[PDB]
Structures are given as C-alpha cells and as structure tokens.
C-alpha cells in the first residue's frame, strides 16, 4: 500500500470530464474505513 500525499489522509478523485460522475476516494490505511452495511442485490435488466 502507498502512502497518503504528505500532509493528507486520503485522496479525492474529482471527475473532470464526465459531468455526471460522482467522486471516488482512496485511503491508505485500512483502519480508516469500517464496513457498516452489507448489501445483497441483483442488477435489473432494463425494460
């Protein structure tokens, strides 16, 4: 695992092309996330 950029705790990937995309985020220490909900699902075929 890499390290956060110095003076930071994470990286934010801001979409700069696809205006409909939301952000993605990266952490470099597993202790910085807790898996709070487990969601079981199917994707649905469009009609």
């Amino acid at each position: 695992m890499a390290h956060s950029p110095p003076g930071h705790h994470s990286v934010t990937g801001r979409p700069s092309v696809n205006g409909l995309a939301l952000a993605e985020y990266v952490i470099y220490r597993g202790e910085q996330a807790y898996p709070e909900y487990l969601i079981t699902y199917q994707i649905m075929r469009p009609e």
Partner: protein
C-alpha cells in the same frame, strides 16, 4: 467477532441505505462492460455489520485524524465493491484489499456512485463476471456491496478524467 444483523425493509435505516444505493446509479463510459447494463437494483437484503474490535480500530484512527485536522474527521458513507467482501467484514480492511494499479496509487478505493463499486464486485474490470455464468452482466446471480464509514481527514484533491 463479526455478527450480521438483518435489517427489516420497514426499518428507516434499510430504506435510507436502499435509497443511497439506487439513487447513485449512473451510466458508465464502458457501456456496461465491467458492471453490467442496468438502471437500478433489486435489493434482496441489507445487514448491519457488527464487530467491536474493528469498530474500535476505526474510531481510534478517526480520533487521530480528527485531532490532526481541526477536530474534523471528514467522515463519509461510501460504497466498496470487492471480491474480498467476506474477508473484509470478518477481518477489516487491509493491504490485501487495495487496488494496486489504481489511478491514485495502491490504496483502498471507495465510490459515491454505487454503480462504480458494482464494477469491482467480480474483480477489476468485472473480472470474468459471475462465478456461475461467467457473465459480468448477470441478472440472476446475487451480488454484494459494502456501504462503509470512511474517514477522509484532509483529502488531497486530484482533478482527473
């Protein structure tokens, strides 16, 4: 140490988690190649993941971060899709769960868009799709995503395509 508690669909907590899942689906630039073609999900179950040791590990780090960032953890709720979902819920996130070739370096990646995280449930690029039918767009096989509490602290902003 992990216990999974089923939420009732009548429970407000079920409903708010479902709504975040469904409302953050978008179309992807791959036309559905990695994650499948869909506009919405059939949510079959939502479970709360309860592990005291992992929770304490998290809040300990969250306090450290907070104290380095003017008492602001910058905590978010984000999606994570992974083939290692079963290991993560029992043992926590770690180096084994990182995306080694990710655009932002080897770290653990999370998404605001549930459909982004859906792209990784069967592996990077959707791998070979579901174990049963080898179909990245399988409408039959049950998938699992995590909705996770994430401490961002001071986050480095990367503008990117």
């Amino acid at each position: 140490g992990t216990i999974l508690i089923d939420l009732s669909p009548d429970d407000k907590e079920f409903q708010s988690v479902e709504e975040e899942m469904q409302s953050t689906v978008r179309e992807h630039r791959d036309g559905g190649h990695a994650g499948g073609i869909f506009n919405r999900y059939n949510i079959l179950k939502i479970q709360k993941v309860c592990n005291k040791k992992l929770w304490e590990r998290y809040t300990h780090r969250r306090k450290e971060v907070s104290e380095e960032n003017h008492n602001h953890a910058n905590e978010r709720m984000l999606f994570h899709g992974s083939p290692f979902v079963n290991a993560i819920i029992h043992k926590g996130f770690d180096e084994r769960h990182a995306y080694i070739g990710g655009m932002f370096g080897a770290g653990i990646y999370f998404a605001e868009n549930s459909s982004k995280s859906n792209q990784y449930v069967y592996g990077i690029g959707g791998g070979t799709g579901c174990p049963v039918h080898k179909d990245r767009s399988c409408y039959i096989c049950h998938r699992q995503l995590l909705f996770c509490r994430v401490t961002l602290g001071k986050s480095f902003l990367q503008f990117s395509a």
